[PDB]
Amino acid sequence: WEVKEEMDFPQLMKMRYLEVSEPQDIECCGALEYYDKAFDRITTRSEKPLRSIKRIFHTVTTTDDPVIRKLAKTQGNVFATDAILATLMSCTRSVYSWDIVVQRVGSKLFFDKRDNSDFDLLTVSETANEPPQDEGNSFNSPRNLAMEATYINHNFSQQCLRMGKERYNFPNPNPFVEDDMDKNEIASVAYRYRRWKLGDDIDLIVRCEHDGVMTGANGEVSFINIKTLNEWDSRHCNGVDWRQKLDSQRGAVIATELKNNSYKLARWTCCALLAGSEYLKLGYVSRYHVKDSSRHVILGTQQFKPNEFASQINLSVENAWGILRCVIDICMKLEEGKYLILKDPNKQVIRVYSLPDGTF
RNA sequence: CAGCCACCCGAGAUUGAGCAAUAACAGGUCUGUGAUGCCCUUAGAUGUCCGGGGCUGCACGCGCGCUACACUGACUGGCUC
Ligand SMILES: [Mg+2]
Ligand SMILES: [Mg+2]
Ligand SMILES: [Mg+2]
Ligand SMILES: [Mg+2]
Ligand SMILES: [Mg+2]
Ligand SMILES: [Mg+2]
């Protein structure tokens, strides 16, 4: 194992390259499904429980994914699937470590998923004042709270929209993304291929996410994303009650979640922005009562524009794209050997490691 | 503990008044009284009636108010409590 590139969050704070044209499209694929306004309008004092739905996992690297593999080698040299540039676009916000694999084989610069002491699962309360103890195998332990959080954004995603109704079919099918056998539990989740200019052959073939579509008040296609939070043990991290405040002081709840979860919200915001979706839907999920997991209730959903909300997470897309360009610059000197980008967990500085003999 | 804050359900989670202590004030009223002490006046009456005048007088200084200075308006018509 070799050490190649190391940079702190301070350098990323002052890195910028505002060269992002209006994005084009390459191909859009994946059947969509409508939503229910009654499930949206569920509010505090009018509860509704959270059941379990079956999520067909569709996380795959670009190379193995057949739709990308029949388009990556044809044109373009810089490639990055969805929710993967957020790692490089949330460096100054993150405090933990993530792992990703950028392979500079020839002129190709395609990102891929890799695991080295960290996973892709949701991270909760990572950068908060007075962080949670996370000791042993407690209810608030990191892997188990993360597993609970991933449970929620897998189930409620498939519990807010009218899944049982006839799914609208886009013209192109999603090849090999849960298409080998029609399990009939294939969700509304569609994927777009879009290309935009950022620099030296950085026409980025990029996958997108659409967690559903919502019919307009006048009636037309309007894509949406469905992602949700989770409440637990309000005394910790200087929390606030959602069952008493969501109806009339929801702004404070958003404020304290932004204060508590910053890396996570930026991670979501990146995805919701690059997908070009119309509405971002944030569901509010809380435990039945304190100190009791495996039971949750959906306390409401809020609609905000993915761009306006990007302005309200004090995130600049300019410096984000610039730190992306600068990490590609730091990954331009490297060679055919791939690079596992493992940051330093205890002291947050970005790092990467060239893989010996193609280490995976 | 007396209590306080928020919320649910509720017509309503502080409706508004009347009455209102012990002590006082040289507070106001003798111009409310066939309530009243004392003093004054009592046939050219300060009783009472009639006629006329005045309270309203006008260089000025205050107090309670009404109408305004406009176009978020005035005028004309219509319609509705
Ligand atoms: Mg006196
Ligand atoms: Mg008297
Ligand atoms: Mg007379
Ligand atoms: Mg007078
Ligand atoms: Mg007066
Ligand atoms: Mg006039």
Side-chain angles (χ1 to χ4, degrees), chain A residues 192-218:
Chain A
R192 302 187 52 181
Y193 285 162
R194 292 155 59 117
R195 49 186 285 104
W196 49 74
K197 183 275 170 184
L198 180 138
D200 176 76
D201 328 315
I202 316 285
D203 268 335
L204 300 106
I205 288 195
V206 170
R207 202 173 112 182
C208 289
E209 319 287 9
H210 286 299
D211 304 333
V213 178
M214 188 167 65
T215 81
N218 34 284

Side-chain angles (χ1 to χ4, degrees), chain A residues 83 145 159 215 252 289:
Chain A
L145 212 77
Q159 212 182 286
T215 81
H289 59 61

